[PDB]
Amino acid sequence: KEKKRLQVVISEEQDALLTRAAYALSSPERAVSKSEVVRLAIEKIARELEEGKAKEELEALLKHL
Amino acid sequence: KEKKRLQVVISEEQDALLTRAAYALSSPERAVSKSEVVRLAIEKIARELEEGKAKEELEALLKHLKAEEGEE
Numbered sequence A: 001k002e003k004k005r006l007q008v009v010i011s012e013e014q015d016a017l018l019t020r021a022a023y024a025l026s027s028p029e030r031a032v033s034k035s036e037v038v039r040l041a042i043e044k045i046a047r048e049l050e051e052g053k054a055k056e057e058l059e060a061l062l063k064h065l
Numbered sequence B: 001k002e003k004k005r006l007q008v009v010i011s012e013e014q015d016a017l018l019t020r021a022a023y024a025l026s027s028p029e030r031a032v033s034k035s036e037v038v039r040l041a042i043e044k045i046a047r048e049l050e051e052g053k054a055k056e057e058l059e060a061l062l063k064h065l066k067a068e069e070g071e072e
């Protein structure tokens, strides 16, 4: 009702992108875990779909599978 | 060519956002699951951090998200 266990299979390249994003977002004063990067990505995509941005890039990367 | 089982706890609001995004990106000709939306979000935000434009905004949303982890 308040929390949902998300199970997603990812590639090792997406794992590497997760690590690079986690380090890029981090700083000496704030630590960023991979799960926080996932939640932040979900929130950012939700906002962009609220604004309708980068749809050419969203479908470009989705068709890039 | 490895893979990785990923376990992440999310709020019900983000799960609903995941559903809405899954349907919005889907079509009768192509199905987009919630997990595929998660992968697309990962690659999208990683690319955004490589571009170096929206780092301030991502840090703000990140701060507010870390403010929500502590006991709702």
Ligand SMILES: [La+3]
Pocket (backbone or CB within 6 Å): A002, B011, B012, B013
């Ligand atoms: La809630």
Ligand SMILES: [La+3]
Pocket (backbone or CB within 6 Å): A012, B001, B002
């Ligand atoms: La490999």
Ligand SMILES: [La+3]
Pocket (backbone or CB within 6 Å): A011, A012, A013, B001, B002
């Ligand atoms: La691979």
